[PDB]
Ligand binder design. Structure first.
Ligand SMILES: [Mg+2]
Length: 291
């Protein structure tokens, strides 16, 4: 039987749970099913990676390129302005999520388009990432290592840059076979320089779309009817729309920011909310009981 009261990881003051008995019931199903029934579906930026370090704000996969030596200060002025105009839209409380779709497409298309202009070679991404300020959450080695140990599917679903994401996890030693990455991947020309992005755009609000267009992946995993979902945005809640059959799903949300504005919405939509939390210990503690 599961008791969150007896799990020291859940006593941390960053842990917000609206419905503890409901959560206990889900973790209880997760445990019952064990390895055989489990898969992970996860956002990357600010979920697997840190939102902040030494009083310092950590980069997203996009920020890694924005900030690198291969991009002018003049490109960074444009990128900044874009963020100011379009982030105001993203967080606008009066607009419906649906009304924001076209704005998001515009933002990612404009900002990717400035990066394409800077001329990013594939061969250089290794060093760009090594020199970057990127940080994985405390407990990542344990997170990925228990998962690979038990062959648990991990579907990282990211509106970031997939090439950047992969380099981060590769340099961290956690890009194991069990880890599938769906993201905005770069498209390279003859010389291995960036010319555009592959496929259809994944942004913060349309993960339902990509989730359904990954049938390929989810139907092979019919038997994995227990899901752990991790996100930091409301849009990450749609990341499991493509799952065959769902028996138990636990939704864990990182609330990193805008805490007073978003806490109620987060507590109502995610099962567990992790306020200003830079580790993976609550999910690791659930993996430990389960695996
Ligand atoms: Mg994120």
């Amino acid at each position: 039987a599961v008791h969150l009261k007896m799990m020291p990881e859940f006593q941390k003051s960053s842990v917000r749970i609206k419905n503890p008995t409901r959560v206990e019931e889900i973790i209880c199903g997760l445990i019952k099913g064990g390895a055989a029934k489990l898969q992970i579906i996860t956002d990357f930026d600010m979920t697997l990676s840190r939102f902040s370090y030494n009083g310092k704000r950590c980069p997203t996969c996009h920020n890694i390129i924005d900030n690198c030596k291969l991009v002018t200060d003049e490109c960074r002025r444009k990128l900044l302005q874009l963020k100011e105009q379009y982030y105001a839209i993203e967080v606008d409380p009066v607009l419906t999520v649906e009304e924001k779709f076209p704005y998001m497409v515009e933002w990612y298309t404009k900002s990717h388009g400035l990066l394409i202009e800077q001329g990013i070679p594939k061969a250089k991404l290794k060093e760009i990432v090594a020199d970057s300020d990127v940080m994985l959450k405390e407990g990542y080695e344990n997170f990925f290592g228990k998962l690979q140990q038990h062959g648990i599917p991990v579907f990282i679903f990211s509106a970031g840059i997939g090439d950047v994401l992969e380099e981060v996890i590769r340099q961290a030693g956690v890009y194991h076979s069990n880890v599938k990455v769906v993201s905005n991947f770069m498209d390279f020309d003859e010389n291995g320089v960036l010319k555009g992005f592959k496929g259809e755009l994944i942004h913060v609000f349309n993960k339902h779309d990509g989730a359904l267009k990954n049938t390929d992946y989810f139907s092979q995993l019919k038997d994995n009817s227990n899901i752990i979902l991790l996100g930091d945005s409301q849009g990450d809640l749609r990341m499991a729309d493509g799952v065959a059959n769902v028996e138990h799903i636990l939704k864990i949300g990182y609330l990193n920011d805008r805490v007073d504005e978003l806490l109620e919405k987060y507590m109502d939509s995610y099962d567990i909310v992790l306020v200003k939390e830079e580790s993976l210990e609550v999910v690791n503690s659930i993996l430990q009981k389960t695996l």
